[model samples]
Target: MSRVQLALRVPDLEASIGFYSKLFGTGPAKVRPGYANFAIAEPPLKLVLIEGAGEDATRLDHLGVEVEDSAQVGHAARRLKESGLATVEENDKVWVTGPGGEPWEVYVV
Candidate 1:
């Protein structure tokens, strides 16, 4: 199984982290100088926030699916390729773009 992933580019990482922490009723699973990731169990979401971006940068930085292992990544990539979506893999990560040019990544933690 895979979990839905959402990466948001924010101008102020701290503020966004605070807001999400409250909204999700939990803090981030990991945090660094310019990044924070929240793994929410209730909604099975992998929410990531990265600093250093324009104010309106939250317009969907990128969408992704978080898998348990590299094998799942291969499975997803093959499925996507079979569905006519061009996929490219690098460093055990797969990238694909949707019809509207929305970028998607299938990766394992």
Candidate 2:
């Protein structure tokens, strides 16, 4: 099966890990002196914390969701379509937006 991953920049590594460990109900699945990765099954969430913030905070660039199989893409697409949300498909990948155009792409692999 596939999952979702997010990269976040935090000021304090230990504090961030503490907060997320509780929020996620599990300590870091993998942790280094400066980094951590938490794999959560509820939302299938993978969070990676890096040390510094990016220069271009104004732009998120992009994020993505990977479904278990290609067939699941259609299910996600249908849900988005029914929500009256905007969508775009390119390279057989679908991009859906939440409020303020937070773009999330869903593709099967």
Candidate 3:
């Protein structure tokens, strides 16, 4: 299965965790000292939060897609280029830089 991952950088993990819990009607699937990620089934989304950025947090940190197979990620790399979207890869993950430098990533679980 594949799902969209929205990595939201936050200043307060607890606050974000509390709010997102209500928004999605569920708690996070995993939580760390400065990181948390929700495996939301309703919309099939991976909502990740990382604590940082001080007071100016809550920014759209980056974006990513989780694929079942790593090979599937390879296809995405070519597909994006076939569509003329600039892409970059490091190790195995694929990433893109959007207008104004919005980030996008594609990787396997």
Best by TM-score: 1
For every model shown, the clashing-pair count is 0, 0, 0
TM per prediction: 0.91, 0.51, 0.89
lDDT of 2 by residue, 1-109 (tens): 7688676766666777999989888988888876777878887876777655533332244567877776688777878788888888665467887787667888764
User: Model 3, which residues run further than 4 Å from truth?
Assistant: none
How would the candidate models be sorted by TM-score, starting from the highest? 1, 3, 2
Model 1: CA > 4 A from native: 54-57
lDDT ranking of the models = 3, 1, 2
Model 2 off-target regions past 4 Å? 53-62, 66-109
Q: Which candidate, 1 or 2, would have the higher lDDT against the true structure?
A: 1
Candidate 3 local distance difference test against the native? 0.90
- Extract clashing residue pairs from model 2: none
Tens digits of per-residue lDDT for model 1, 12-53: 999999999999999999999989999999899999998865
In model 1, the worst 10-residue window by lDDT is 52-61
Candidate 2: deviation at residue 90, Å? 18
Query: How far is 35's C-alpha from truth in model 1 (Å)?
Result: 0.9
